[PDB]
Amino acid sequence: KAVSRSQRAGLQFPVGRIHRHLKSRTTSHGRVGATAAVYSAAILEYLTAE
DNA sequence: TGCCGAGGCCGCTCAATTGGTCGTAGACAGCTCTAGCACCGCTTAAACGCACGTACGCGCTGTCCCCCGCGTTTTAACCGCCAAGGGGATTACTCCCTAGTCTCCAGGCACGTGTCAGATATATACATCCTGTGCATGTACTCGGGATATTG
């Protein structure tokens, strides 16, 4: 049974659709997995203010 | 009449700009770096651009049908003005304080290297999440009639 990384952060937003998005805006180099979990929850958190 | 009074043209003297000449001091141009490490040339096995009916989606098209535009003029005060008054923004000076220079002096840390790890990428298998689709009601809407608020 697969989990989802959204549940391990505790977030409603898609932590793995981000990551794949960031990996397309990246010079020629990679992106840490712990970036998607404070990339998200600093896009959610504008929702629930907007 | 008178007188003269009031009247209208021309060399000193001073006070900014303007352009000139003096001399001297770092800072610019250039050399040789030399030195080295990037550009190139030379292969390779490579990804990704690209020239090209057809299904067909929608951009554009020929109609009628009405408000908001279009036109007028009264007026209404908005907006402009001028002139006066008061002060507060301004000017010119004297005293004053520190901005700025230099110089000495230390160690803080930004700089740099020296090793090599926990990081994240990439593959394959894959299950699952998420999209596109199809599908009832529930509301937010437009209307009509009356109450409350506010303008003149």
**CA–CA dist A49, A19 (Å, integer):** 24
**CA–CA dist A50, A30 (Å, integer):** 31
How many degrees, rounded to 5, is the angle at CA A20 between CA A14 and CA A25? 125
Establish whether the CB of A16 is closer than 7 Å to any nucleic acid atom in strand B: no
Name beta bridge partners: A4.
none
Name beta bridge partners: A43.
A45
| A35 CA vs B144 C1’ separation (Å) | 60
Establish whether the CB of A21 is closer than 7 Å to any nucleic acid atom in strand B: no
| A38 CA vs B14 C1’ separation (Å) | 79
